[PDB]
Design a protein around this nucleic acid. Structure first.
Lengths: 326, 116, 48, 521
DNA sequence: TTGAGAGCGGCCCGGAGCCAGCAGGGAGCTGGGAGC
DNA sequence: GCTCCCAGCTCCCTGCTGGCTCCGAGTGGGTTCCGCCGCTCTCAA
């Protein structure tokens, strides 16, 4: 059986190099110098080098002495282990999208209308434009009056407007974009994007309780965490046996009077002592600001480092002096 | 040969039975190169669309199938040389499967990819 | 490496990129190594 | 000397044949005064053009701009050429300034001369610290050799045989099997090539171990297979190992005496000459050589330096042009010459190298201190910094001898002018009468020899080399003659009258050992 | 509508330990045959 | 004719020669230097 040899090529041109070499084999297979190799392999997830299935490195060299994309592998080729054949051959696997190219790269766009021609779709998008002021960009709301005042390439149709190379806006850009240039899977816009247009997070050292099943109302400490079905190892009170529970069965229950932290939300980054634990609402007085925060047990978290008392930007602390106006 | 060899990268799609990776132009001009008599690929487009899958992962240039362990792995050692697909995502229609079974050619799926 | 071991796991790119990461952390320890060439910057000066 | 670039597919080759140098001119095309250039922090760089001959269908493209090349002041193509004191003071430049320095980015820079070992000359030194008894080294390099200089070592082992150290060779190959790989498998012509006067019994007892070790190989092909073995790129079998051995024998083995099958016998004779020198060194009849001899040291000026640097980066430019044309012919489109040539990659690279003084292209390490800033403090200071000489031997070291003061300095360097700090003696300042040889082609000299009566080494009978005197030109061996008398006098008087022998080219007649060397270098 | 430009996006010797390779004693192993 | 002192063997072990890291006195002052290539859309003709 022929063996596989790694030969290096230009990145992003492996398929074109393979097509060129097999076309050269077609053009020279009936000649006096045929290619004695068996095949070539170009995986879709492997970039930088390709595989040659052949018996000899001399045959590999005689195959790759063609187009100059394979020069650095023409200097030397490497071998593939016999057990790596299978690992080479294996292949592993009113909406919202994100644009690929242009100045609007990686931005949330709302697919409003889908054209049945399967070519372009209409997107409502936030314009990253300077309204023809700097160019002769952060996201901001479209200003039809401002762009009409600045003039230039602009056409006014009330709420609808055309500017800067057939960029269409209404009330918000409403422009057709390519199906291949948009990504329709794996977007998941957040609440801020919803306003403009489940999850499990368990950490070791925290206490979680079981509220259902034959092991009901059982509080135990978190030892491990997994993706969906954790099969946790809880340290239950008066129970040295090491049970198993998923995140759906567990609930982040904390004992009365402990330092609790908010992982995310409006009250994120705060530390405080709880007041009364209801079934969903937990009220706490935060430490730096003795203020009532009503948060969820899922948003709650236990840690030993209290609030630092400084902003997210690292510029102003709590209880600080600033200038509202001069 | 060159008739089996595709001429361009546009509209590449693989067959469902022999996993032959050829373009729409030579499906229209020649059809299949392996089981054309068993499929009657010539003279239509809707049935060719049903009998071909546009989603294929990886291609292999088997041209010496009598001495190729890769050809023995994908069971294409008895087929003609050409461009074949490792994985083909699709299935023939029930009537075509039943008529192939009646003619004596059992349809074996080429979907060798691991689904999760 | 983390993404590749999460999804691909073809193990050849894994081993080769692990060797380059090992060379990178070895460069972090010392830029000058008798066994491997030193790292290079676009400014033309050797790394410290 | 740069070969035309040929590429297939429709073949085409591009060749450069005519230089069109121009007066320095920036853009609106106008010449720059050196004063205003150094005031606006510009450079005194002159445009350069070539003509292009392409054959895809022959096309000619004359006056094609490569880049801008720096010019030092008061040169033959400078604006300050032939202008008198009145014209120069009207042009607000000093008439008494010597000139001859580069101005880059407004900064005033002067090259310092580098001292180098002599080229294409056998040299014998004491090597008792190593395992060898003696070593004879030869730096082989052609005039305008695209490859850099190579070094051939021959070594007498201390114990009693002779081996060799060769480029791209990881072993110490015997001289006899080298001769057999060259083709001289006969002991008789091996002896007649290693000696000139046949009656040498002392040579018998000091050569017998080498041949008495190496006689067992008697085949040229077997010897070439041995050369290919233990090499940088050894063949799997004798096939292509013979090719590796042949390309080593051609390209690497003595290129200064020529690279051809006709030059192969000259290579063999000259290898016999170095081993003869090694034998006389071992006997001690001929005195050994000193590395501190400034006769055996050469002094590079800016000319060879700039020529070498431009050669290397012009090779890089040709690499860029050929990969650009290869990209377009892969794309199936005709290559564009003006977009193929890069004024940036020529002019900016030259400017960076000259301004920095590091002797590389962008990164290279590289030798620094090649060019410094002129000390505009005193006229005497300027003259000293202009006539300054640099020995690149290792500073901050305890090696006393190369920075010691040598006897060979009467009238070449003033004795009592040294730097005082960490480097005392490695930096010299040029004396008054001392002048550097500009160098000349030795082809009219060889034509003088051959119109005269000094026969080449290939036509002369071997045994009747015992009586005659050897004749070398620029180190490499040319021929022999029976009586050097009256032809030494003819060469002297022709040098005096500058009819065909120039005053600059020198000749030395060793009468103690029967030879004469001509130096055009 | 197409072509190039602006800007975003990605790619010269010193010592001295020091291991490794090799070379000579050395007792165990089992034959050799002396002894019973 | 089988132990056992002995001979040859056979591993056994301490005892000699090579590639190799690491060092190489004190301040001022001036000069040079820190991407390149790729790539897609904007305005101009």
């Amino acid at each position: 059986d022929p063996n596989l040899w790694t030969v290096k090529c230009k990145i992003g041109e492996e398929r074109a190099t393979a097509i060129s070499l097999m076309r050269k084999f077609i053009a020279y297979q009936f000649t006096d110098t045929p290619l004695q190799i068996k095949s070539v392999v170009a995986p879709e997830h492997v970039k930088g080098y390709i595989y040659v299935e052949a018996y000899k490195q001399t045959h590999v060299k005689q195959a790759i002495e063609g187009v100059g994309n394979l020069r650095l592998g023409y200097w030397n080729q490497q071998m593939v282990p016999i057990k790596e054949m299978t690992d080479v051959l294996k292949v592993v696997k009113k909406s919202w999208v994100r644009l690929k190219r242009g100045i609007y790269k990686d931005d949330i766009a709302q697919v409003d209308y889908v054209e049945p021609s399967q070519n372009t779709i209409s997107l409502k998008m936030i314009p990253r434009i300077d309204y023809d002021r700097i160019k002769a960009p952060p996201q901001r709301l479209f200003d039809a009056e401002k762009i009409r005042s600045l003039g230039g390439d602009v056409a006014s149709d009330g709420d609808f407007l055309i500017f800067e190379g057939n960029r269409y806006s209404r009330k918000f850009l409403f422009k057709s974009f390519a199906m291949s240039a948009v990504i329709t899977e794996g977007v998941k816009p957040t609440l801020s994007e919803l306003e403009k247009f489940r999850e499990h997070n368990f950490q070791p050292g925290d206490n979680v309780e079981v509220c259902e099943g034959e092991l009901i109302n059982l509080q135990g400490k978190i030892l491990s965490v997994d993706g969906n079905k954790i099969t946790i190892m809880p340290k239950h009170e008066d129970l040295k046996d090491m049970l198993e529970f998923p995140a759906q069965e567990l609930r982040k229950y904390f004992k009365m009077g402990d330092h609790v932290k908010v992982i995310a939300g409006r009250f994120e980054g705060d530390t405080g002592l709880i007041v009364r634990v209801e079934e969903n609402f937990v009220i706490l007085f935060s430490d730096l600001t003795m203020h009532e925060l009503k948060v969820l047990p899922r948003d709650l978290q236990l840690c030993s480092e209290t609030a630092s008392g400084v902003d997210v930007g690292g510029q102003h602390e709590w209880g600080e002096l600033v200038q509202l106006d001069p | 040969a060159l008739e089996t060899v595709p001429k361009d990268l546009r509209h590449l799609r693989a067959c469902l039975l022999c996993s032959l990776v050829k373009t729409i132009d030579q499906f229209e001009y020649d059809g299949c190169d392996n089981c054309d008599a068993y499929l009657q690929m010539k003279g239509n487009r809707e049935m060719v669309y049903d009998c071909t899958s546009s989603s294929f992962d990886g291609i292999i240039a088997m041209m010496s199938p009598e001495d190729s362990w890769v050809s023995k792995w994908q069971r294409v050692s008895n087929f003609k040389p050409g461009v074949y697909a490792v994985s083909v995502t699709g299935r023939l229609p029930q009537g075509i499967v039943r008529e192939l079974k009646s003619r004596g050619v059992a349809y074996k799926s080429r979907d060798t990819a691991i689904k999760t | 490496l983390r993404r590749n071991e999460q999804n691909g796991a073809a193990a050849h790119v894994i081993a080769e990129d692990v060797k380059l990461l090992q060379f990178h952390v070895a460069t972090m320890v010392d830029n000058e190594l008798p066994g491997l060439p030193r790292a290079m910057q676009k400014s033309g000066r050797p790394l410290k | 000397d740069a070969p035309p670039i040929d590429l297939q597919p429709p073949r085409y080759l591009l060749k450069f044949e005519q230089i069109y140098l121009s007066k320095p001119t920036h853009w609106a095309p106008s010449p720059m005064m050196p004063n205003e250039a150094r005031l606006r922090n510009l450079t005194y760089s002159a445009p350069l053009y070539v003509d292009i001959t392409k054959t895809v269908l022959q096309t000619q493209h004359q006056k094609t701009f490569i880049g801008k090349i720096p010019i030092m002041l008061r040169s033959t193509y400078c604006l300050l050429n032939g202008l008198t004191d009145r014209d120069l003071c009207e042009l607000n430049e000093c008439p008494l300034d010597p000139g001859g320095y580069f101005i880059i980015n407004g900064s005033e820079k002067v090259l310092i001369a580098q001292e180098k070992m002599a080229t294409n000359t056998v040299y014998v030194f004491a090597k008792k610290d190593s395992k060898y008894a003696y070593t004879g080294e030869c730096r082989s390099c052609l005039e305008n050799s695209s490859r850099p200089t190579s070094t051939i070592w021959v070594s007498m082992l201390a114990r009693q045989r002779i081996v060799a150290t060769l480029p791209y060779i990881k072993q110490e190959v015997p001289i006899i099997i080298v001769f057999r790989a060259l083709g001289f498998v006969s002991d008789r012509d091996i002896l007649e090539h290693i000696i000139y006067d046949f009656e040498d019994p002392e040579m018998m007892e000091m050569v017998k171990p080498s041949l008495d070790e190496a006689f067992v190989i008697q085949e040229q092909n077997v010897a070439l297979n041995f050369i290919g073995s233990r090499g940088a790129k050894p063949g799997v079998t004798k096939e292509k190992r013979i090719k590796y051995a042949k390309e080593v024998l051609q390209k690497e083995m003595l290129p200064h005496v020529g690279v051809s099958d006709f030059c192969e016998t000259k290579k063999a004779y000259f290898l016999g000459y170095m081993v003869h020198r090694l034998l006389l060194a071992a006997l001690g009849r001929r005195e050994l050589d000193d590395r501190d001899h400034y006769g055996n040291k050469r002094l590079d000026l800016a000319g060879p330096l700039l020529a070498f640097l431009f050669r290397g980066m012009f090779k890089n430019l040709l690499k860029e042009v050929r990969i650009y044309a290869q990209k377009f012919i892969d794309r199936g489109k005709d290559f564009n010459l003006e977009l193929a040539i890069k004024t940036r990659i020529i002019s900016d690279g030259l400017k960076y190298s000259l301004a920095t003084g590091n002797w590389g292209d962008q990164k290279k390490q590289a030798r620094a201190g090649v060019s410094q800033v002129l000390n505009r403090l005193t006229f005497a200071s300027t003259l000293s910094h202009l006539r300054r000489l640099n020995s690149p031997i290792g500073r901050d070291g305890k090696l006393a001898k190369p920075r010691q003061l040598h006897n060979t300095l009467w009238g070449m360097v003033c004795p009592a002018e040294t730097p005082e700090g960490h480097a005392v003696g490695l930096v010299k300042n040029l004396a008054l009468m001392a002048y550097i040889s500009v160098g000349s082609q030795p082809s009219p000299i060889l034509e003088f020899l051959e119109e005269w009566s000094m026969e080449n080494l290939e036509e002369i009978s071997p045994a009747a080399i015992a009586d005659a005197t050897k004749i070398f030109v620029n180190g490499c061996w040319v021929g022999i003659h029976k009586d050097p008398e009256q032809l030494m006098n003819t060469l002297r008087k022709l040098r005096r009258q500058m009819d065909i022998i120039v005053s600059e080219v020198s000749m030395i007649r060793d009468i103690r050992e029967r030879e004469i060397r001509i130096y055009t270098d």
